[PDB]
C-alpha cells in the first residue's frame, strides 16, 4: 500500500504493473476494522458519540468511492483500471517528452505539472466518449451505401491511425 508513491512514474510503472500498488483495495478494504465491530459491543451507555462521527466517516468514504466509479462509467472505462481514450493530447500546453515523463518523474510531480486543465480534461473526455462515439454506435445498426463503401472518409479513417 502506497509502497512506491515516491518513485518516478518509470519506477511507478512498477506500481501499475501491480494493482496500481494496491491502492484501490486499500481504499475499500481499510474499512475492515470499523466493518468488523460497529456491532460487537453489547452495552447500553444510553447515548453514542461515535453514532454520528463513525457514520459520517463511513458514508463519506462510500460516496467518495462511488464518485470515481461513476466517473469511470461516464468515460466508458468502467471496470478497467487502465483504459485509453479517443480524446487526443490536445492543444494542452504541457507538451513535453515521453522519455522524460515515464522515466524520470514521480506521480506527485506529475500532479504538480497538470494541476491546471484537469477539469478541462475531465470535461473533454466524455465528449469523445459520448457525443460522437455513442452517436456512431447508434448509427452502427443501420446505414446506406457508405457503411460498406463510402470511399472518402475511409482513407482519412485510415489517416487518423496514419497521422
Amino acid at each position: 500500500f502506497l509502497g512506491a508513491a515516491g518513485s518516478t512514474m518509470g519506477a511507478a510503472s512498477m506500481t501499475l504493473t501491480v494493482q496500481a500498488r494496491n491502492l484501490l483495495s486499500g481504499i475499500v478494504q481499510q474499512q475492515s476494522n470499523l466493518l468488523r465491530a460497529p456491532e460487537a459491543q453489547q452495552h447500553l451507555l444510553k447515548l453514542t458519540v461515535w453514532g454520528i462521527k463513525q457514520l459520517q466517516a463511513r458514508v463519506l468514504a462510500v460516496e467518495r468511492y462511488l464518485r470515481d466509479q461513476q466517473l469511470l462509467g461516464i468515460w466508458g472505462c468502467s471496470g478497467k483500471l487502465i483504459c485509453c481514450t479517443n480524446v487526443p493530447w490536445n492543444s494542452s500546453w504541457s507538451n513535453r517528452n515521453l522519455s522524460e515523463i515515464w522515466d524520470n518523474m514521480t506521480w506527485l510531480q506529475w500532479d504538480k505539472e497538470i494541476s491546471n486543465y484537469t477539469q478541462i480534461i475531465y470535461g473533454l473526455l466524455e465528449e469523445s466518449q459520448n457525443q460522437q462515439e455513442k452517436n456512431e454506435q447508434d448509427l452502427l445498426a443501420l446505414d446506406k451505401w457508405a457503411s460498406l463503401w463510402n470511399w472518402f472518409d475511409i482513407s482519412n479513417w485510415l489517416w487518423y491511425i496514419k497521422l
Partner: protein, 220 residues
C-alpha cells in the same frame, strides 16, 4: 460489387500440371478468405481449400493436400491455383469464390459464407487435337429429326434450327466425354411430317475451336 473474373477454360496434355487465375475486382483482394471449390460437370459441388492474402494462411484439402498450391499476389492483385497431375478425374468446374461481409459493401464484418462468387470455367483435360465434325439429317403427323454433331474436338457446340427462327419446341442434349477420344452431341426438335418439302429445316452448328459453322439440310 465484388467481381471475380476467373481466367478462361483450358485444354492441356494429361499427366502434366495446370494453373488457373482469379482476378478479383471491387472490395478487397486481401483481409478476406478467397477460396476455391470444385464440381464435377454433373455432380453436386465440392470444396477444396483457400488462402488469406494478408497473412498467407493456406487451409488446404483433406485429400488433395500435397498436390494443391494456392498463392496470393497482392502487388498485381490476383490469386492463382496450381494443381498437378492432370487426368480425366481432375475434370471439374473450378469456381473461385470470396467470403462475403455484413452490409452492402466489402469492408465490414465477414460472414463466413461464400457470398460473392465468380463465373467459373470447366477445367477439363484434353486427350486429342481439334476436329471438325459432320452434321446429318437424322430421319424419323409429327416427324422427328436431329442434327447429330458427333465425334468432334473440343466441347461445346450449339444447335439452332433455321438460324434460330424455329425457337420453340427445342430439345438439345449435352456433349459427352465419350469412349473414342472425341466428343459427340445430339439435338432434336419437333416438326410435323407434312411440312417436309415446304419448310426446309436447316440446323446451324457453332464449333468455335474447330471452325465449322455450316448450314445443313434436314429433308428426310
Amino acid at each position: 460489387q465484388v467481381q471475380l473474373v476467373q481466367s478462361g477454360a483450358e485444354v492441356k496434355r494429361p499427366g502434366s500440371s495446370v494453373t488457373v487465375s482469379c482476378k478479383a475486382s471491387g472490395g478487397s483482394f486481401s483481409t478476406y478468405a478467397l477460396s476455391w471449390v470444385r464440381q464435377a460437370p454433373g455432380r453436386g459441388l465440392e470444396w477444396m481449400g483457400g488462402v488469406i492474402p494478408l497473412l498467407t494462411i493456406t487451409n488446404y484439402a483433406p485429400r488433395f493436400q500435397g498436390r494443391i498450391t494456392i498463392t496470393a499476389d497482392r502487388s498485381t492483385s490476383t490469386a492463382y491455383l496450381e494443381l498437378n497431375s492432370l487426368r480425366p478425374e481432375d475434370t471439374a468446374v473450378y469456381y473461385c469464390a470470396r467470403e462475403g461481409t455484413t452490409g452492402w459493401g466489402w469492408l465490414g464484418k465477414p460472414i463466413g459464407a461464400f457470398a460473392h462468387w465468380g463465373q467459373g470455367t470447366l477445367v477439363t483435360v484434353s486427350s486429342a487435337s481439334t476436329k471438325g465434325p459432320s452434321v446429318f439429317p437424322l430421319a424419323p403427323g409429327t416427324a422427328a429429326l436431329g442434327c447429330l454433331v458427333k465425334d468432334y474436338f473440343p466441347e461445346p457446340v450449339t444447335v439452332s434450327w433455321n438460324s434460330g427462327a424455329l425457337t420453340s419446341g427445342v430439345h438439345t442434349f449435352p456433349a459427352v466425354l465419350q469412349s473414342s477420344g472425341l466428343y459427340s452431341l445430339s439435338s432434336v426438335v419437333t416438326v410435323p411430317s407434312s411440312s417436309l418439302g415446304t419448310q426446309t429445316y436447316i440446323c446451324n452448328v457453332n464449333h468455335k475451336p474447330s471452325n465449322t459453322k455450316v448450314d445443313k439440310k434436314v429433308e428426310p
